[PDB]
Design a protein around this ligand. Structure first.
Ligand SMILES: [Zn+2]
Ligand SMILES: [Zn+2]
Ligand SMILES: [Zn+2]
Ligand SMILES: [Zn+2]
Length: 143
């Protein structure tokens, strides 16, 4: 057979922090360190289908913070797509797993998930995750 009820999930690991206004965000974050955060994502979750994850894309963002005492806001992130993820609830033989994007993202990235409707400027925890459906109704297997 074929299981045609899997989804592709766009995932993003975020570190948002403040730095002194005379510094640059690239003194704190590197493409190398963000790639190593990606390597720490769980790649064998019970909800994971075949074909693993896309190439990770590191990103560094900087802006002066109006509300801070002379500080800049740094947003260091690494994004990738989980090509094939199960839909619904999944029984692995011993227990149930919720394969919804929020609980799936939190298990795989290990940080609290926030809906894309909540902007980075309205999130006050330092480490968090993003996850949303980028493709629905894909095969769960690689064929
Ligand atoms: Zn198939
Ligand atoms: Zn299949
Ligand atoms: Zn960091
Ligand atoms: Zn970082």
């Amino acid at each position: 057979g074929h299981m045609l009820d899997c989804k592709a999930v766009a995932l993003k690991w975020v570190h948002q922090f403040r730095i002194p206004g005379g510094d640059n965000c690239n003194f704190y974050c590197s493409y190398d360190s963000l790639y190593q955060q990606f390597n720490l994502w769980k790649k064998n979750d019970a909800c994971q289908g075949a074909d693993g994850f896309s190439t990770a894309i590191p990103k560094i963002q900087e802006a002066p913070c109006s509300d801070c005492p002379g500080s800049k806001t740094c947003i260091c992130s690494v994004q990738a797509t989980a090509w094939r993820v199960r839909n619904g609830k999944w029984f692995d033989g011993q227990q149930w797993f919720d394969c919804d994007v929020k609980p799936y993202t939190e298990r795989v990235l290990g940080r609290r998930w926030y809906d894309e409707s909540e902007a980075d400027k309205d999130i006050y925890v330092g480490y968090y995750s993003r996850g949303f459906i980028s493709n629905d109704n894909v095969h769960c297997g690689s064929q």
